[PDB]
Nucleic acid binder design. Structure first.
Ligand SMILES: O=P(O)(O)O[C@H]1[C@H](OP(=O)(O)O)[C@@H](OP(=O)(O)O)[C@H](OP(=O)(O)O)[C@@H](OP(=O)(O)O)[C@H]1OP(=O)(O)O
Ligand SMILES: [Mg+2]
Ligand SMILES: [Mg+2]
Ligand SMILES: [Mg+2]
Ligand SMILES: [Mg+2]
Ligand SMILES: [Mg+2]
Ligand SMILES: [Zn+2]
Ligand SMILES: [Zn+2]
Ligand SMILES: [Zn+2]
Lengths: 193, 261, 292, 71, 145, 49, 50
RNA sequence: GUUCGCGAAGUAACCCUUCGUGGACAUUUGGUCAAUUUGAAACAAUACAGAGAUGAUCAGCAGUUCCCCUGCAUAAGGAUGAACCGUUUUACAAAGAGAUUUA
């Protein structure tokens, strides 16, 4: 509903939450269809949730063994940096991916003592904590990002935007000061009129 | 009474028989927020209404009559109301008793309950303005209504005089052949608002014509709000009735000061 | 000032008769109908068991500048519309008072934020300046196409037959109809004469009036109504050749009738507007030939 | 769909199909009639150019006759 | 609200966008309430919009810490045993569904089917007499006053 | 055939021809410009005629 | 009429302040009185310089 | 409908069933909102135009605007985002000559 309200109807969401264009785009489309880091991180977050719920579905339908299910969640939570692609919109989540790769090393050599190198491991509880804590820290972040976006959709953006100075416009603003000070000290010493 | 109060209102269209909510496809993908079609061009978008009001047939008591509802059913006028006698709004031609109830209310909103706006729409279509008590409709687009039958110029007015006479008391009906359009003025504004939605996208065919099977293929006529009447034979009638309206208000207004003192 | 805002201006007849009314405040509800700028939407119901929500459509500033309520937009004193108010004051001051309104969005907003009154809103909201103008209303109450070939058509108009009891006809021919005198007013006058009121239910009579040809015709179902229409009309005029004509009597007007003795029908008065005017001009003489 | 804003005239008038279809090809002439009529009266001063443009007008106006002739 | 194209849905269309800010909160309440391996189905308590915009899982999972440590220790041994004796362990395929097909409705395709066996350890009868009644309950000793 | 207006570029684009643009009325003075307004209006309606 | 004014319990998902948008307005200047610009003096001799 | 009474009838023997009749219990939902054309998304496409400082090609920052777009953004992009590139007459005087008027 967000994509269709923005006017974008050539962007398709598949049901596994990938956003793909339906056609080759003019540049006026590519400037219009830039979705920010809020939407995509929200889309990658639902994709992770859809990815976990569907494995519990395929166990529930009888298609998946109970030990395959526990390996399934253990495969997901170790490889969210491989299955989703949430890392590009917040690279800070690479800390959690290092956490889920480190716990994976800690669990395996405890688990895979004396039984080879199979894919059977399904002790998904520690890596489950890491994404559950990361979801704790990015509730308030995403509430702010998407709260700004929808109020920008429903109200437009502000007319009163004032540009703070940065590195690029430093010498330009130093000019506008220097013009105005010389304007004042000469317009005060003129005769009159 | 005998035609209206005696019976109850009848279901015009079955709820399965109602049209689909999506419009006809004039684009490549459907848009979900705005319920329209997006890519490519935009074609026409006007079609003949499949449904029409038979006023002496479909009128009757409804649920809004016992509740004291003030407003008329919008889809009674289009011939589309699927609730029948279970509908909250009224299902009959507006009468002097009915517009007397709407008298405090008609000033800002129509007989259908939709709010009037400040100025008119650009094509004089839609609901209307509260700034002008317009009682005259511009009956236009008559060629697409008639399915491009010629007929004559005065027979077209005969179709207009028969259809709009069922929708209320009429001040006058004027047809202009060179402009191929009619001007129907009503006694009340509420009839004019009622007949506007009743006769939008309709056809003046009368099934005694051979195109009656192809009434759907046409375009459908435009009933819109009329502009002022530019001939001074009508302009002098405007300020004459505005004078009589002012004299009828001053008698009522000095009695307010009589009671105020 | 968003924290210091006036109370809403609403009528007495908007609020109705009951004593206590529960009103809902929404601090930025809808935008104004007039100035297209947001305000505090109040809405309420007359009784508790009503079924109509009465909303405030315009902001208080647009309601102040016009001196109208926010709900029904009638004037706060005199309870009349704005167009009729500025026309009543113009008959007193002999100059046009008029509130003019923008059609541009940036000038609908600009015209509201100024603190003036508009139109008759200087006269109203001053009870002294309103009451003397009512007294000034009171003294006003102390005063209290020769090239057309029309001959194909006048053969079908009767123009030569009499209004007697003895022909038993359905339709009649109405001429001497002015450019005033609306189509409903003639049908009410006939239905008042016959007591066949709420005639549109049973469709007892059908009437077509051109208003350009200054002519009409009324058609009856069930021909026995024709003799009731004849016998209920007493005053007639006899042309000095003969051929008596009944008069229909709408207030200050006179309309003559003939039993048509067929179903004339639309296009009988004409097929073109330039052609229709000459039919009025053709009768002008016969009316003067009937009377004088 | 299929726009009628993409394709050509199409060249032969008699080979065109049912009447609800040639109606939109017909207005697909009238717009260029309207556009290049506005391009007649312009003071832009190229007398050679508006002469070949005048011939294109006469060509399209003859087509407009032919689309009306088929109907 | 599967296919919402009517005019009545206009306020509810706004509601879905307005619930988008709350949606990472619902994901937190969903993934913390995920069923642990020993349980087939887990009935959670939800808070939903009357327009059906969003469905929050209105629960926090409390566990008893010695009970929870033993429960995962039992499933640790069970998966450690299961990996040993299975000839070939087939990891499931990701993503589980085709992206073309919509997520299938619960009441038609899932609610009727029996679940499946859970990952419960063999369990001793003599050594584990006190705990074998209630170790694999969804909420262990929930009604034991 | 009437002249077509220029198309609005943005939403609140102003038809300057439609109304007094940003009507800054003059300050209300004392010297009673009552007959003078009648003579401009008579002259301005004469100019449009 | 004595009027009881209450607040509507809004849907926390539908946006609050429905008539609120980022629109730009130009404001008229209300002037009832003229502020006199009270300078003093009519030197003023100009040496052609400056 | 429940519960407390009171009365009448029948089974009863003071209890049960029936229907008469006082109480008590429980007390004013929802709507800023009606279901396709006529109360307002936009974009693609056709055609035409063709691209800041320059001779020529190339980096850009800004600034003013009743223009905004994307972005979570006070970051940054949008062609240096765009528009700008035109129109242009009186706080007006002092001094010195030849035609023409006046009365
Ligand atoms: O780099 P290697 O020495 O070959 O180690 C691999 C590698 O370890 P990680 O899982 O930590 O990355 C595999 O991971 P992939 O990058 O190939 O996905 C992993 O595969 P699984 O995740 O399927 O276990 C496999 O582990 P295992 O052998 O238990 O299957 C493990 O090799 P070792 O575990 O034997 O060291
Ligand atoms: Mg840069
Ligand atoms: Mg920039
Ligand atoms: Mg760039
Ligand atoms: Mg710039
Ligand atoms: Mg460049
Ligand atoms: Zn209805
Ligand atoms: Zn306002
Ligand atoms: Zn009012």
């Amino acid at each position: 509903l967000l994509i269709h309200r923005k006017g974008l109807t050539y962007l398709h969401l598949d049901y596994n939450f990938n956003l793909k264009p339906t056609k080759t785009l003019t540049t006026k489309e590519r400037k219009k269809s830039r979705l920010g880091n809020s939407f995509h991180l929200m889309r990658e977050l639902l994709k992770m949730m859809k990815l976990i719920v569907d494995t519990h579905v395929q166990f529930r339908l009888g298609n998946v063994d109970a030990f395959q299910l526990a390996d399934g969640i253990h495969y997901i939570l170790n490889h969210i940096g491989q299955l989703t692609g949430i890392y590009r919109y917040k690279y800070k989540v690479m800390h959690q991916i290092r956490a889920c790769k480190d716990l994976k090393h800690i669990i395996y050599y405890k688990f895979n003592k004396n039984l080879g190198k199979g894919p059977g491991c399904g002790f998904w509880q520690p890596a489950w904590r890491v994404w559950l804590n990361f979801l704790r820290g990015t509730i308030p972040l995403l509430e702010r990002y998407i709260g700004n976006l929808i109020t920008r959709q429903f109200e437009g953006r502000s007319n009163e935007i004032v540009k703070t100075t940065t590195k690029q416009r430093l010498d330009a603003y130093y000019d506008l000061e220097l013009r105005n000070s010389v304007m004042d000290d000469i317009l005060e010493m003129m005769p009159e009129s | 009474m005998t035609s209206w109060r005696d019976k109850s209102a009848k279901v015009q269209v079955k709820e399965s028989e109602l049209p689909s909510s999506i419009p006809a496809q004039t684009g490549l993908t459907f848009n979900i927020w705005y319920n329209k079609w997006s890519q490519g061009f935009a074609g026409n978008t006007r079609f003949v209404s499949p449904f029409a009001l038979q006023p002496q047939l479909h009128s009757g008591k409804t649920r809004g009559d016992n509740d004291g509802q003030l407003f008329f059913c919008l889809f009674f006028a289009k011939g589309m109301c699927c609730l029948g006698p279970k509908c909250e709004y009224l299902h009959h031609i507006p009468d002097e008793e009915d517009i007397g109830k709407l008298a405090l209310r008609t000033e800002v909103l129509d007989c259908f309950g939709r709010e009037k706006f400040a100025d008119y729409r650009e094509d004089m279509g839609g609901i209307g303005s509260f700034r002008k008590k317009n009682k005259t409709l511009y009956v236009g687009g008559i060629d697409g209504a008639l399915n491009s039958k010629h007929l004559k110029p005065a027979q077209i007015e005969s179709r207009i005089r028969f259809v709009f006479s069922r929708l209320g008391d009429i001040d006058r009906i004027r047809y202009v052949e060179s402009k191929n359009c009619g001007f129907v003025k009503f006694k009340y504004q509420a009839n004019a608002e009622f007949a506007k939605e009743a006769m939008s996208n309709q056809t003046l065919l009368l099934p005694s014509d051979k195109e009656w099977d192809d009434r759907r293929e046409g375009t459908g006529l435009l009933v819109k709000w009329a502009n002022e009447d530019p001939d001074p034979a009508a302009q002098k009638r405007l300020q004459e009735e505005l004078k009589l309206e002012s004299l009828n208000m001053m008698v009522h207004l000095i009695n307010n000061n009589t009671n105020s003192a | 000032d968003e924290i210091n805002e006036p109370p809403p201006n609403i009528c007495e007849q908007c609020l109705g008769d009951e004593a206590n009314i529960r009103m809902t405040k929404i601090p930025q509800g809808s935008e104004c109908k007039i100035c297209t700028l947001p305000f505090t939407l109040y809405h309420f119901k007359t009784s508790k068991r009503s079924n109509n929500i009465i909303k405030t459509l315009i902001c208080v500033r647009c309601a102040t500048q016009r001196n109208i309520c926010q709900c029904c937009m009638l004037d706060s004193r005199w309870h009349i519309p704005i167009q009729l108010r500025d026309h009543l004051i113009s008959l007193v001051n002999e100059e046009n008072v008029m509130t003019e309104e923008a059609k541009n969005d940036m000038m609908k907003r600009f015209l509201s934020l100024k603190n003036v009154k508009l139109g008759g809103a200087q006269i109203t909201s001053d009870p002294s300046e309103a009451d003397n103008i009512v007294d000034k209303l009171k003294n006003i109450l102390l005063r209290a196409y020769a090239s057309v070939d029309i001959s194909h058509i006048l053969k079908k108009l009767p123009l030569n037959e009499s209004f007697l009891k003895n022909p038993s006809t359905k339709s009649f021919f109405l001429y001497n109809i002015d450019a005033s005198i609306p189509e409903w007013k003639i049908t009410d006058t006939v239905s008042q004469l016959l007591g066949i009121k709420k005639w549109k239910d049973g469709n007892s009579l059908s009437l077509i009036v051109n208003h350009k040809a200054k002519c009409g015709g009324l058609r009856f179902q069930s021909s026995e109504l024709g003799e009731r229409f004849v016998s209920k009309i007493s005053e007639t005029l006899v042309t000095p050749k003969g051929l008596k004509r009944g008069v229909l009597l709408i207030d200050r007007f006179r309309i003559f009738i003939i039993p048509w003795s067929s179903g004339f029908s639309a296009a009988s008065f004409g097929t073109n507007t330039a052609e229709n005017i000459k039919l009025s001009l053709s009768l002008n003489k016969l009316i003067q030939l009937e009377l004088g | 769909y299929k726009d009628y804003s993409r394709y050509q005239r199409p060249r032969n008038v008699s080979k065109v199909k049912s009447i609800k279809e040639a109606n939109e090809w017909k207005r697909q002439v009238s717009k260029e009639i309207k556009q290049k009529s506005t391009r007649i009266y312009d003071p832009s001063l190229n007398e050679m150019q508006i002469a070949e443009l005048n011939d294109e007008l006469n060509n399209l106006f003859k087509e407009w006759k032919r689309w009306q002739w088929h109907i | 609200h599967s296919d919402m194209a009517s005019k009545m849905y206009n306020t509810d269309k706004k509601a879905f966008l307005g619930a988008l800010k709350y949606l990472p909160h619902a994901i937190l309440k969903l993934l913390e309430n995920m069923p642990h391996p020993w349980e087939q189905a887990k009935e959670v308590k939800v808070l939903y919009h009357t327009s059906g915009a969003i469905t929050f899982v209105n629960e926090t999972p409390r566990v008893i810490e010695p009970v929870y440590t033993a429960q995962w220790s039992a499933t640790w041994i069970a998966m450690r045993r299961e990996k040993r004796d299975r000839t070939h362990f087939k990891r499931m395929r990701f993503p589980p569904f085709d992206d073309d097909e919509p997520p299938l409705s619960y009441e038609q395709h899932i609610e009727n089917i029996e679940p499946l066996d859970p990952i419960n350890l063999p369990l001793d009868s003599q050594d584990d007499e006190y705990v074998k009644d209630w170790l694999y309950d969804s909420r262990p000793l929930e009604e034991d006053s | 055939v009437a002249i077509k207006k220029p198309k609005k570029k943005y939403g609140t684009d102003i038809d300057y021809n439609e109304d007094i643009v940003y009507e800054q009325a003059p300050m209300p003075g004392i010297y009673d410009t009552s007959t003078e307004d009648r003579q401009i209006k008579k002259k301005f309606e004469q100019f449009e005629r | 009429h004595h009027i009881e004014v209450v607040s509507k319990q809004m849907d926390p998902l539908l946006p609050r302040f429905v008539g609120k948008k980022a629109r730009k307005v130009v404001a008229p200047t209300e002037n009832d009185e003229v502020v006199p610009v009270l300078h003093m003096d009519g030197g003023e001799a100009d040496p052609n310089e400056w």
